[PDB]
Scaffold this active site. Structure first.
Site, PDB file in Angstrom:
ATOM      1  N   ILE A  21       0.830  -1.200   0.000  1.00  0.00           N
ATOM      2  CA  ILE A  21       0.000   0.000   0.000  1.00  0.00           C
ATOM      3  C   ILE A  21       0.868   1.255   0.000  1.00  0.00           C
ATOM      4  CG2 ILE A  21      -1.516   1.438   1.398  1.00  0.00           C
ATOM      5  CD1 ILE A  21      -3.091  -0.972   2.149  1.00  0.00           C
ATOM      6  N   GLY A  22       1.795   1.329   0.945  1.00  0.00           N
ATOM      7  CA  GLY A  22       2.695   2.459   1.028  1.00  0.00           C
ATOM      8  C   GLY A  22       3.892   2.220   1.918  1.00  0.00           C
ATOM      9  N   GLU A  23       4.738   3.236   2.030  1.00  0.00           N
ATOM     10  CA  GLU A  23       5.964   3.135   2.803  1.00  0.00           C
ATOM     11  C   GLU A  23       6.204   4.391   3.618  1.00  0.00           C
ATOM     12  OE1 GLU A  23       8.944   0.653  -0.074  1.00  0.00           O
ATOM     13  OE2 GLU A  23       9.873   2.007   1.376  1.00  0.00           O
ATOM     14  N   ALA A  25       9.569   6.043   6.551  1.00  0.00           N
ATOM     15  CA  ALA A  25      10.980   5.973   6.891  1.00  0.00           C
ATOM     16  C   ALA A  25      11.317   4.698   7.655  1.00  0.00           C
ATOM     17  CB  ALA A  25      11.396   7.197   7.688  1.00  0.00           C
ATOM     18  N   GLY A  27       8.671   2.250   8.493  1.00  0.00           N
ATOM     19  CA  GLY A  27       7.516   1.376   8.455  1.00  0.00           C
ATOM     20  C   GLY A  27       6.971   1.094   7.071  1.00  0.00           C
ATOM     21  N   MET A  28       6.135   0.068   6.969  1.00  0.00           N
ATOM     22  CA  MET A  28       5.499  -0.291   5.707  1.00  0.00           C
ATOM     23  C   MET A  28       4.050  -0.738   5.877  1.00  0.00           C
ATOM     24  SD  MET A  28       6.754  -2.976   2.770  1.00  0.00           S
ATOM     25  CE  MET A  28       8.070  -1.935   2.166  1.00  0.00           C
ATOM     26  N   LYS A  44       0.242  -2.291   9.226  1.00  0.00           N
ATOM     27  CA  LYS A  44       1.419  -1.441   9.209  1.00  0.00           C
ATOM     28  C   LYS A  44       2.568  -2.034  10.006  1.00  0.00           C
ATOM     29  CE  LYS A  44       1.727   3.031  11.048  1.00  0.00           C
ATOM     30  NZ  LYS A  44       1.670   4.494  10.798  1.00  0.00           N
ATOM     31  N   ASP A 139       0.941  16.284  10.254  1.00  0.00           N
ATOM     32  CA  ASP A 139       1.300  15.717   8.955  1.00  0.00           C
ATOM     33  C   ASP A 139       0.093  15.483   8.043  1.00  0.00           C
ATOM     34  OD1 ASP A 139       3.251  15.129   7.120  1.00  0.00           O
ATOM     35  OD2 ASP A 139       3.611  13.093   7.805  1.00  0.00           O
TER      36      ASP A 139
HETATM   37  C1  LIG Z   1       4.367   3.321   7.247  1.00  0.00           C
HETATM   38  O1  LIG Z   1       3.676   4.505   6.840  1.00  0.00           O
HETATM   39  C2  LIG Z   1       3.186   5.206   7.874  1.00  0.00           C
HETATM   40  C3  LIG Z   1       2.279   6.321   7.349  1.00  0.00           C
HETATM   41  N1  LIG Z   1       1.067   5.888   6.597  1.00  0.00           N
HETATM   42  C4  LIG Z   1       1.247   5.893   5.126  1.00  0.00           C
HETATM   43  C5  LIG Z   1      -0.072   5.992   4.377  1.00  0.00           C
HETATM   44  C6  LIG Z   1      -1.051   5.081   5.037  1.00  0.00           C
HETATM   45  N2  LIG Z   1      -2.121   4.476   4.439  1.00  0.00           N
HETATM   46  C7  LIG Z   1      -2.790   3.712   5.386  1.00  0.00           C
HETATM   47  C8  LIG Z   1      -3.983   2.943   5.007  1.00  0.00           C
HETATM   48  C9  LIG Z   1      -4.796   2.301   5.951  1.00  0.00           C
HETATM   49  C10 LIG Z   1      -5.902   1.619   5.463  1.00  0.00           C
HETATM   50  N3  LIG Z   1      -6.221   1.551   4.151  1.00  0.00           N
HETATM   51  C11 LIG Z   1      -5.378   2.195   3.324  1.00  0.00           C
HETATM   52  N4  LIG Z   1      -5.680   2.147   1.973  1.00  0.00           N
HETATM   53  C12 LIG Z   1      -5.032   2.704   0.884  1.00  0.00           C
HETATM   54  C13 LIG Z   1      -4.391   3.903   0.704  1.00  0.00           C
HETATM   55  C14 LIG Z   1      -3.945   3.867  -0.607  1.00  0.00           C
HETATM   56  N5  LIG Z   1      -4.276   2.733  -1.223  1.00  0.00           N
HETATM   57  N6  LIG Z   1      -4.953   2.018  -0.279  1.00  0.00           N
HETATM   58  C15 LIG Z   1      -5.471   0.694  -0.618  1.00  0.00           C
HETATM   59  N7  LIG Z   1      -4.248   2.901   3.693  1.00  0.00           N
HETATM   60  C16 LIG Z   1      -2.112   3.859   6.589  1.00  0.00           C
HETATM   61  C17 LIG Z   1      -1.008   4.722   6.359  1.00  0.00           C
HETATM   62  C18 LIG Z   1       0.052   5.236   7.232  1.00  0.00           C
HETATM   63  O2  LIG Z   1      -0.069   5.205   8.456  1.00  0.00           O
END
Ligand SMILES: COCCN1CCc2[nH]c(-c3ccnc(Nc4ccnn4C)n3)cc2C1=O
Length: 345
Positions: A21-23, A25, A27-28, A44, A139
């Site tokens: 989904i994302g990254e 510094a 965490g993933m 996460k 943020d």
């Molecule tokens: C390690 O990074 C820490 C910061 N960070 C990055 C962006 C993020 N996105 C979700 C999340 C949670 C639930 N659903 C989604 N969905 C989703 C988004 C895009 N595409 N998708 C499928 N994103 C949690 C977080 C988060 O806490």
């Protein structure tokens, strides 16, 4: 033990079929299927033990989320970790899965005024709750605002969040900051640590502008350039605004600049609602003391079709003071993370 982007996710076998989904510094984030719950979730992975700063951010993120409960804010469903401190290498936060985020949406889709108005209301509604808890997000950006198909919005990523500290906000000129640059208030660059609520309001305004045009309003190429962009639109700060900046380095830099007049919002957003532009003007105000507050923003004519104070809740247990996590070594901080996550074992 599946892998993603080179990262081992020890969430099996209750959670399977991980998708990136994302990254960040340290965490993933991945999606996965929750066997015995029959739903797909977000997971996460956090690895902050190697650095003190990360351990502080982790404990704060977990502590906040565990106490927060609000429709417009991502919550924690579960926390996976080793049974012992010696074996604990990472921390896995399980959250509800959202289809997408605003960053992904704006890259492809034009937003109708109705969508913009509705998205903005939900952000401010969530933010009212956050601020009522005496917490600062610090943020707020499009990639941190999640969406589903029915247009429900949830705020995520409380990694840089802190308890507000207004009496210790002052700082020097061009002091380093960790928050995203395009959504960074002007004062961060001049005299602010970002310990006041007005820091989040600036970010929201930047988001509102982006929803209007599908483009970032202050797209600085680097740290120095960010203030160039803000001043380019807002124009030269007034005498009154300048007198609140007592650090001489900052004030003298501002005074050294050629006179620039303010660029009118209707010139940048000619297709936008005039009430939306009014609210944008109050959010993107140079002086942080003159900047509109979350509760005022909600009561703004632009959001009059959603505004319901009885239906905009606040926190039951606001945080009394920020924890002194800065001093603590990576070791005592780990033990605190361990204790905070114990209930889920
Ligand atoms: C390690 O990074 C820490 C910061 N960070 C990055 C962006 C993020 N996105 C979700 C999340 C949670 C639930 N659903 C989604 N969905 C989703 C988004 C895009 N595409 N998708 C499928 N994103 C949690 C977080 C988060 O806490």
């Amino acid at each position: 033990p599946e892998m993603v982007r080179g990262q081992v996710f020890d969430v099996g076998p209750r959670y399977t079929n991980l998708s990136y989904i994302g990254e960040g510094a340290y965490g993933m984030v991945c999606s996965a299927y929750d066997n015995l719950n029959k739903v797909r979730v977000a997971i996460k992975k956090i690895s902050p033990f190697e650095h003190q700063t990360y351990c502080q951010r982790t404990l704060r993120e977990i502590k906040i989320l565990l106490r927060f409960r609000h429709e417009n804010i991502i919550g924690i469903n579960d926390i996976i970790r080793a049974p012992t401190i010696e074996q604990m290498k990472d921390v896995y936060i399980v959250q509800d899965l959202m289809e997408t985020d605003l960053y992904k949406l704006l890259k492809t889709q034009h937003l109708s005024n109705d969508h913009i108005c509705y998205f903005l209301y939900q952000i401010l509604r969530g933010l009212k709750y956050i601020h009522s808890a005496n917490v600062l997000h610090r943020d707020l950006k499009p990639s941190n605002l999640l969406l589903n198909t029915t247009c429900d919005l949830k705020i995520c990523d409380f990694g840089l969040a802190r308890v507000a500290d207004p009496d210790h906000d002052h700082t020097g000129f061009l002091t380093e900051y960790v928050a995203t640059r395009w959504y960074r208030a002007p004062e961060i660059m001049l005299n602010s640590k970002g310990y006041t609520k007005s820091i989040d309001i600036w970010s929201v305004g930047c988001i509102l502008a982006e929803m209007l045009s599908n483009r970032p309003i202050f797209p600085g190429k680097h740290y120095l350039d960010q203030l160039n962009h803000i001043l380019g639109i807002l124009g030269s700060p007034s005498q009154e605004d300048l007198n609140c900046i007592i650090n001489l380095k900052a004030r003298n830099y501002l005074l050294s600049l050629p006179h620039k007049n303010k660029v009118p919002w209707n010139r940048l957003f000619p297709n936008a609602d005039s009430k939306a532009l009014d609210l944008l003007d109050k959010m993107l105000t140079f002086n942080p003391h003159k900047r509109i507050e979350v509760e005022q923003a909600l009561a703004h004519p632009y959001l009059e079709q959603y505004y319901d104070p009885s239906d905009e809740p606040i926190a039951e247990a606001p945080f009394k003071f920020d924890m002194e996590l800065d001093d603590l070594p990576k070791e005592k901080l780990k033990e605190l993370i361990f204790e905070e996550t114990a209930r889920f074992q």
